[PDB]
């Protein structure tokens, strides 16, 4: 086991970002598991060397209902030594664009994880050239940390 991508997606935008990151991480002969974070016991993260969380942002910059349980679930695990990163899909029409990226970044650092880079912030779906290149650069820099 190596790198885990746990994502929360409702309309598919964050899921599409998770798919792009995994494919890049595949090209480096890493072991990349792709999972949804809902109903996922947070204990599973300790089997991995790297962990990449991903979530969309819901009302008033709050985590979606599905991700707050997993976020609170992280309260009781030591992530010391785990190299982590965060991504998310939001909409700049809101004041708190991709607050979920900041929320999960603080929580992972709050539990001893080594945050290797600033989170990836995509608007809506990664359905154009520079969004795909944003994901491609983010995933490669994470692989350079390994």
Ligand X SMILES: Cc1cc2nc3c(=O)[nH]c(=O)nc-3n(C[C@H](O)[C@H](O)[C@H](O)COP(=O)(O)O)c2cc1C
Which residues contact Ca ion (rule: CB under 5 A)? 123-124, 128, 130-131
Sole binder of ligand X in the list 61, 115, 141, 143 (CB under 6 A): 61
The 3-state DSSP class for residue 59 equals helix
Q: Which residue is nearest to ligand X (CB)?
A: 90
User: Is residue 101 near ligand X by the rule CB under 6 A?
Assistant: no
The token pair that represents 18 in the structure block: 């998770």
Sole binder of ligand X in the list 12, 72, 133, 145 (CB under 6 A): 12
Which among 34-42, 83-91, 107-115, 138-146 is the span making contact with ligand X, rule CB under 6 A? Answer: 83-91
Q: Are 122 and 13 in contact (CB under 8 A)?
A: yes
| Closest listed residue to residue 1, CA positions, set 100, 108, 82 | 82
Residue 28 or 61: the one with the smaller Cβ distance to ligand X is 61
Which among 41-49, 51-59, 79-87, 112-120 is the span making contact with ligand X, rule CB under 6 A? Answer: 51-59
| Residue bearing tokens 């010391």 | 80
User: Is residue 144 near ligand X by the rule CB under 6 A?
Assistant: no
| Residue bearing tokens 């798919």 | 19
**Shortest distance, CB of residue 71 to ligand X, whole angstroms?**
16
Q: Are 18 and 45 in contact (CB under 8 A)?
A: no
Q: Residue 61, annotated ligand binder?
A: yes
What gap in Å lies between CA 115 and CA 109, rounded to an integer?
7
């Amino acid at each position: 086991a190596k790198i885990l991508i746990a994502y929360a997606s409702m309309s598919g935008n964050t899921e599409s970002i998770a798919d792009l990151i995994k494919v890049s991480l595949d090209a480096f002969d890493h072991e990349v598991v792709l999972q949804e974070m809902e109903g996922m016991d947070a204990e599973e993260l300790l089997a991995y060397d790297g962990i990449i969380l991903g979530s969309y942002t819901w009302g008033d910059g709050e985590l979606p209902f599905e991700a707050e349980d997993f976020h609170d679930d992280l309260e009781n695990i030591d992530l010391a030594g785990k190299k982590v990163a965060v991504f998310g899909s939001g909409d700049t029409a809101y004041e708190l664009f991709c607050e979920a990226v900041t929320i999960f970044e603080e929580r992972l650092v709050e539990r001893g994880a080594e945050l290797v880079q600033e989170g990836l912030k995509i608007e809506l779906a990664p359905e154009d050239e520079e969004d795909v290149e944003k994901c491609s650069n983010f995933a490669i820099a994470f692989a350079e940390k390994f």
